[PDB]
Amino acid sequence: SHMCDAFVGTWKLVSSENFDDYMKEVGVGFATRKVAGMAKPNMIISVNGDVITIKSESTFKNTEISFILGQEFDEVTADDRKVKSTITLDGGVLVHVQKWDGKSTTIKRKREDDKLVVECVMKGVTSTRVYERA
Numbered sequence: 001s002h003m004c005d006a007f008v009g010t011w012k013l014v015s016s017e018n019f020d021d022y023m024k025e026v027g028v029g030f031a032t033r034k035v036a037g038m039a040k041p042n043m044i045i046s047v048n049g050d051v052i053t054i055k056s057e058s059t060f061k062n063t064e065i066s067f068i069l070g071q072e073f074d075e076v077t078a079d080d081r082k083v084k085s086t087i088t089l090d091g092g093v094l095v096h097v098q099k100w101d102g103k104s105t106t107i108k109r110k111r112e113d114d115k116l117v118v119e120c121v122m123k124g125v126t127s128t129r130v131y132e133r134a
Ligand SMILES: O=C(O)[C@H]1[C@@H]2C=C[C@@]3(CN(CCc4ccccc4)C(=O)[C@@H]13)O2
Pocket: 036, 037, 039, 041, 056, 058, 060, 061, 063, 078, 079, 107, 118, 120, 129
């Protein structure tokens, strides 16, 4: 057993708070915000050796990232930002920083009870997204 055991699995979004304002702060346009905001993604987290893969599947977009902790990688976000991403473990919390155009946003994922809680921060705006096991 290992680094992300407690994240691994299939998860379904059950609640979202403040996500439209988070997207606005990030720079997402009106139409994308409205469509993206309806989606209830299935997130699939898996580990193979040192490589973590996070897939998100929904009616809006299907995305996939694979990475090694601490090692920066290129990412195209669902809203079509081209970002430089680094994901680390900080006391049991997966911390994902995305940098683009002199801007930065941080996405934190933590296991709380039987849920996976996702905190998305851009400047002063925080959104919380809660996932249950699928
Ligand atoms: O993990 C989350 O809950 C949040 C966090 C911040 C942004 C995303 C990207 N992502 C997958 C692509 C997407 C985007 C918008 C709506 C549906 C699907 C999320 O679901 C968003 O990671």
